[PDB]
Each structure stands twice: as structure tokens, then as C-alpha cells.
Amino acid sequence: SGRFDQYPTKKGDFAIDGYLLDYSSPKQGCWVDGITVYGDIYIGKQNWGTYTRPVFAYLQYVETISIPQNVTTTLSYQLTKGHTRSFETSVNAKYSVGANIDIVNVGSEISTGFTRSESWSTTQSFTDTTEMKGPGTFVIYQVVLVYAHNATSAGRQNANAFAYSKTQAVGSRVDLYYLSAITQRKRVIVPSSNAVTPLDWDTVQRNVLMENYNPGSNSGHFSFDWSAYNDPHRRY
Ligand SMILES: [Hg+2]
Ligand SMILES: [Hg+2]
Ligand SMILES: [Zn+2]
Ligand SMILES: [Zn+2]
């Protein structure tokens, strides 16, 4: 399907909830209107001054379950916190970010629902439960928050750090553009009849960064707000 122009744009958790609570048609994801912040991100061998903004949110597959007629059960399933399993498996270089980057979420009216030390850390699995009743086949998904980054000057040394990236020259400096993803403490359960094939990390990066963002003009479906550098409230 691709064609990410089909997805709407939402600002903050109330708007994302509005999108997900509209059961009139199956939902896969949305572009996110969020603020840009500036601060350190460790990539490869050092910290780089990085611009970060939220850009997309999507539902990533957890599991499918079929329950017979007259059966009520407490279903246990694994959700994750911190960076997504797909993001973690896709990165080639040493990668880490301090907890204070979360000002990007606060300023964008998004909350991860996880602790300060958990939200931007390594992938950590946890058990979640829902009492469910049959008959039916149901698919469980977890909300993924996607961010675009410009790690300034990182492009000469880290051009192969990520599965998908773009470098851009600024005078004699080389910037590194890439996406990252973390989870939110939010999961959706839908009958197999109200379900479509969910988006995955490879598809999201190809469409959002490679096809829909142009570092050359800082345009496409989103733009970074460079004024973050000059705003103390958006520096972490
Ligand atoms: Hg969404
Ligand atoms: Hg997001
Ligand atoms: Zn905005
Ligand atoms: Zn401000």
C-alpha cells in the first residue's frame, strides 16, 4: 500500500486517542505534529548535538488469539518499554540517549506512560493482561512513537550507524538524519474482521524518512524547527 499521504496528522495524546477510538475503519498509524528539541545523543563513539522531533505513531504487532464460545480467560502477553525491539535490532552502532530528551514528549503533549529511566532506555519486555471472552479472533498491537533526528556533524563517522539514514552537508560539516522508535504504555485489541496488516519498522523508515522527508529543503511531510537551538526551554 505505502502511500503514507493517506495517514492523518495528530497533535498530542488526546488527538492520537481520537484516532484510535474511531472504530469506523481499521487504523494503522498517523503523522505526529510535535516540537523540535536539541541535545546530546550518543552515536558510535561520542555524543552529538542532535535535533529531535516526533514524526509518526503506529501500531506494531504483538499477537493474535482465537477464543471459543462460552470461554472467558485472562490473557497474558508481552509488551515492551523503551526503544522498540525492531529499532534495537536495526541499529549497527553503539546508541544511547539520556532521560532528559523526554522534554520532546512533554512539549508535544505526549506521555510514554513509562518511568523517566525506562522511556528512552533499552528494550525491556513486561507482562500485560486483559480479561477477554470468546467467540472470536483478535489481534493485539502496541503503540510505537517515531522520532526524526538530525545528529549534527555525525555523518562523516556514522554514515552506516542506522538501517536507513541520510547525510546532509552544511558548509564543511556532515549531518546525520535518521529515525528512532520507542513504545507507549498503550495497546489496542481488535477483532480479526476490523484488522489490517500493521506497518513494520522497515516500511515506516522507508516511507517516512526515505520517501517523505527531504533534508535538502527541510521539507516533505514534516520539517525540523531549528529554533530549538536558541530556546533554553527546548534544550535538554
Ligand atoms: Hg497514530
Ligand atoms: Hg511520536
Ligand atoms: Zn507543530
Ligand atoms: Zn519555548
Largest alpha-carbon pair distance within the chain?
Answer: 69
Question: From the CA of 217, how far away is ligand 2's center (Å)?
Answer: 22
List the grid coordinates of 31: 503523522
Let me know how many helices (H) and strands (E) the chain has, helices first.
4, 12
Give the residue numbers spanning the domain of 213.
Answer: 1-236
**Where do the H-state alpha helices sit in 139-212?**
201-205
Please name the residue that has the C-alpha cell 516511507. Answer: 207
- Cα of 103 vs centre of ligand 4, distance in Å, is 11
Q: How many domains are there within the chain?
A: 1
17, 34 in Cβ contact below 8 A? no
Helices (H), 35-158: 85-90, 103-107
Length, in residues, of the chain: 236
Q: How far apart are CA 114 and CA 109, in angstroms?
A: 15
Q: Is 155 helix (H, G, I), strand (E, B) or coil?
A: coil
**What distance in Å separates the CA atoms of residue 108 and residue 10, rounded to the nearest whole number?**
10
Interior/surface letters 53-80, b for 16+ CB within 10 angstroms, e for the rest:
bbbbbbbbebeebebeeeeeeeeeeebb
Dist CA 233 CA 161 (whole Å) = 29
Q: How crowded is the C-beta side of 29, counted as CA atoms within 13 Å? A: 28
221: left (phi over 0), alpha (psi -120 to 50) or beta: alpha
Tell me how far the alpha carbon of residue 130 lies from the centroid of ligand 4, in angstroms: 40
Q: Please report the beta strands in 83-197, taking only residues with DSSP state E, as ranges in sequence order.
A: 95-96, 124-133, 136-151, 165-170, 173-191
Distance CA 151, CA 154 (A): 6
- What residues contact 221, with CB distance under 8 A and at least 6 apart? 4, 5, 31, 55, 208, 212, 213
Joined together, the cell numbers standing for residue 68 give 471459543
Report the distance separating Cα 81 and Cα 84, nearest Å: 7
**Residue 185 in grid coordinates:** 504504555
Query: How distant, in Å, are the alpha carbons of 18, 41, 191, 220 from that of 22?
Result: 6, 36, 14, 27
Alpha-carbon distance 180 to 198, whole Å?
18
How far does residue 169's CA lie from ligand 3's centre (Å)? 25
Residue ranges near ligand 4 (ion) with Cβ within 5 Å: 231, 233
Q: Report d(CA 92, CA 95) in Å as an integer.
A: 9
